[PDB]
Design a protein around this ligand. Sequence first.
Ligand SMILES: Nc1ncnc2c1ncn2[C@@H]1O[C@H](COP(=O)(O)OP(=O)(O)O)[C@@H](O)[C@H]1O
Lengths: 47, 272, 125, 132, 159, 157, 318
Amino acid sequence: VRSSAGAVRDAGGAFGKREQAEEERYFRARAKEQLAALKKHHENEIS
Amino acid sequence: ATLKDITRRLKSIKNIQKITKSMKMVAAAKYARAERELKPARVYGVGSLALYEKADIKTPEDKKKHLIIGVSSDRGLCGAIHSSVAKQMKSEAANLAAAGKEVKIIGVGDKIRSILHRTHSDQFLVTFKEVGRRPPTFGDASVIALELLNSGYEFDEGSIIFNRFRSVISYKTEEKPIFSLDTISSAESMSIYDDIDADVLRNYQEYSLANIIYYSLKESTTSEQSARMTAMDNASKNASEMIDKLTLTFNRTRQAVITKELIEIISGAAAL
Amino acid sequence: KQVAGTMKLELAQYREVAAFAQFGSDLDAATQQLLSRGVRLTELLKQGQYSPMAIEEQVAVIYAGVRGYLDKLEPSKITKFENAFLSHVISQHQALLGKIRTDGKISEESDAKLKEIVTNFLAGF
Amino acid sequence: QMSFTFASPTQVFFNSANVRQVDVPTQTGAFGILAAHVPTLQVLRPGLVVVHAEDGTTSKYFVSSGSVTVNADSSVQLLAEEAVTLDMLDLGAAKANLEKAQSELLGAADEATRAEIQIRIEANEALVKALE
Amino acid sequence: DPAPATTFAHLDATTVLSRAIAELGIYPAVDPLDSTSRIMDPNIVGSEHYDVARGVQKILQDYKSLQDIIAILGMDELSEEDKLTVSRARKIQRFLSQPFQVAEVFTGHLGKLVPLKETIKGFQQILAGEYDHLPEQAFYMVGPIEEAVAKADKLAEEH
Amino acid sequence: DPAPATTFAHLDATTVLSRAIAELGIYPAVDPLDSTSRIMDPNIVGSEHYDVARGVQKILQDYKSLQDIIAILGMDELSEEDKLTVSRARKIQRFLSQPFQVAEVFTGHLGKLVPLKETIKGFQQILAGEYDHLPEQAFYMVGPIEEAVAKADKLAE
Amino acid sequence: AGVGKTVLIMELINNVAKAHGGYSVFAGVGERTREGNDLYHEMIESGVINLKDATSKVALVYGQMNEPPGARARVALTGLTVAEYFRDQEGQDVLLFIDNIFRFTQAGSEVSALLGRIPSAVGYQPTLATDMGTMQERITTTKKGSITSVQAIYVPADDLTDPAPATTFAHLDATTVLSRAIAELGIYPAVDPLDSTSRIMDPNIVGSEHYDVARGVQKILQDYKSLQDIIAILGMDELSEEDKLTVSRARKIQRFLSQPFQVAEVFTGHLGKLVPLKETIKGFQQILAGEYDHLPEQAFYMVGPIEEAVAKADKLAE
Ligand SMILES: Nc1ncnc2c1ncn2[C@@H]1O[C@H](COP(=O)(O)OP(=O)(O)O)[C@@H](O)[C@H]1O
């Protein structure tokens, strides 16, 4: 047996769930910031 | 479990073991660098502390303001570094609040802020991020000192908690006191220092604050990198010790699968 | 043999510090140079459908790559360099390729001429 | 005797050394420290500290800022924020920076900027006066 | 298994639907790093189509490799050339999803057809970085790329 | 295996003794998350009994889920609620162990019968948090929780 | 492959034919025809086989890989027959190389399947234990002579509990682990000093001085292996004097384990040496006690007795 790439997600163990949750956290934060910036740009562009 | 489950778990654990091993290498490199940089900073900070060491300034214990500064980095995976520093910070804050002091807290590093944002959440005065990503410098200490002095908090005393780097295996959560020019002026032990008005004395106090912040930054950075090296070494050893058992189980299950399939084939062949 | 003998060792060294490639920084110049040579060597071995290369051209490309005339190049461009350098050598210096093909060896005269060709081309890229 | 300790954050020049006399600048006024100088605290100004060993040797280190402490037990601690030996500087850069600062001080954008430019001015001025 | 393993040799194109992708809600669940074809060549489909397809596959594979690190370090520790890789890969994963006209019973959305040019152009743009400013959820279950832009605008407005 | 797999359907209450627990020294080695009964009903055993049993199982299951991370990243990489859960789970795992009368010759310890009310009370207390100050080993091989407190007192001197 | 298996086999053949007068047999069970021809020509070149003057030291028996299983399961017995003659009817010691011993069990398995016998645990024949026993139990030291068998071993799936190696290892009286990681370092033979083991590493069998020297070398090499990590992490400058001394001793011992082989002269060019047992024990006793802390590492690379290492040390400073 060898090791593949991205096997932690495949295993589905605690580490896979933990990784998926961490990634979702980070990108939820960045999505909130990007949505705020998009609203701000849309207000700054009516002028 | 089935052969597929053991195969898949074993692959994942091999991945984790490799990641932790490379992490231990990187942490060892950053440790060598930080422990090389800490030599001059150790003597620099010790010299800075020398004054208050050898002219004792017992603060007047009838003050209301305090300041507790904890030092650590943004990153985890470093043992109980942040845990110990936050434990000391909360211990001191509670002991001081027993007497009704208006304590306040500056957290250097996001981890310290987070560990103390449940209780002592309100007492935060200001906090800093991007600590430990790169080695600290006197510029960082100057920035912390500036953002402390400008913040309109006339603290009458303070403590700084950090992780003194005893050795690659051990660190000690040390605390160093810090005072204010109102304490220095009224400290009779300063009577034997000449050319001391309230201008050079408190410029010197500002510089002393910056010095202690920088010394604590260097000590804590070295301690954090040593702790991460040890933690990732232990994690790699745990992963390997787990892969031993998982490989044994995988081989047992592989042989069981071969035997079972073969017995099914020959039992079908015999039955007809 | 002359060229792949050292290419094999360079890739062997790269394969045992491959994991760091992500971290990349935070490491000394030793492993940094190891995995900066390995990436170039790897990107030389990429090849396309139904386009085999004559032995002398493989030797020329691996010579350029391993003797060190590529470590100052962004990896993503390496392929282009190859697909350019190859053609260039095919056009102008056919005599050198003929000598390598027939002698079956990189004589120090041919070695020097090839170094000159690689240096001159790499200069104007 | 005197126990000297001259140490930039980056590097340490003397650690509990034993020098005869050390001449240091200061906000109040540049002055010299000998083996029994009365205790004092001071904060340095852009200048050049001059050290002399037990013998008659000398050494000049240009210091930007810091603090010099002289203690009861005859222990000098000269912590300098940026201490560089003179052989690390170049004239033209400092001179041009000084002249630029003098030029911009006319532009009283604000008192804080006036003070910042003044600090840069006399910094480079000490640099040139050390190198001129 | 012997049955699918033996069938693989009798097809000119396979689209291996995956349960793991279908768990992330991406529908169709087609596995980008296991679906293959025989006409995926620079001669039969054109240079730009081929370059974009290989770019999508390579970025997804890089993301797969990165997830192993993200498992331990957390994702704030990733370098700044890789956080970009992860974000782009997530955007591409979402953009590969699409609502079908026969799934209106499940999703409620309206089925769409995306001619080839829109797909190639949208993936070119997502790879180039022309959409680093939109949230990833802006691409979930949309047709052409312009619809992802409109959806991002609507999310922002309703924010 | 076909034999136990088949017999699982003929029993009211099963009690799965496991070698993994026995290698930890806990005895009886009963596995708390494989043992089952058909009278684990709030209308049969009351509500306090059922709630205590289900809280014990919930916390043990949470600790089992954590074990995968704990075995590599250590306990220094857990939230504070997770550290507290692990501490309670270890206390409960130990407290489930009991010394039997017939095992005096093995252990030397004195065999105990723990009445049902004492068991419910002790586990209710451990779950509430009335014993977060004691160490794990204070619960190892004791009868009712009074003996656990007494042993924790002995260890403190 | 690539580690020195054939050169080591040739050296063992030569030394045992030279220091004992005992011949050797090579039973190539399941032998690739290409590899068999290459081995034949390597031997002819190296002198162990000689086509002219009836002084060959090897009897080659080849059961090729393209013969029905019934013939690959019996060639080991042909080799054993020749060697048994050399032991009983000529009363001497013999070497018996068996490359490979896995292909022997596999051939037996195929024969048993052909006959129609229920396959055992993992598809191996039901008679695996006694099929191995009948062969392995004729390689012994009777009262006329001895057959010493060197059996190349392949471990299927890197599984040391597979029925084939599991049955084989019940008979092995020693193990020699050639490793690539030591051919890279230039030490030859590549024998791995730590993986290699033996049953007679017992003070009763080999003696107290031999035993203690062997354990001293093993301990120091283990310590150097452990310290290599710390040297690779925390730097060399942070090691005590004793640690640095052990590193020096370990590097010198490493280099001293290397030896020049009379059959690999054309590679090294160095004239081959045959180090008698007592000389080896003396050399390692001296190196461990510290008598040679004042010599350079390269003075030990590819030398025979220790005194020859001293001679090299002198000649490399003149
Ligand atoms: N003692 C030695 N001296 C010099 N070279 C050696 C020695 N042992 C092994 N080698 C080299 O290692 C290579 C391994 O090849 P060989 O052992 O002959 O076949 P195989 O790799 O099948 O065992 C040889 O070509 C030889 O040059």
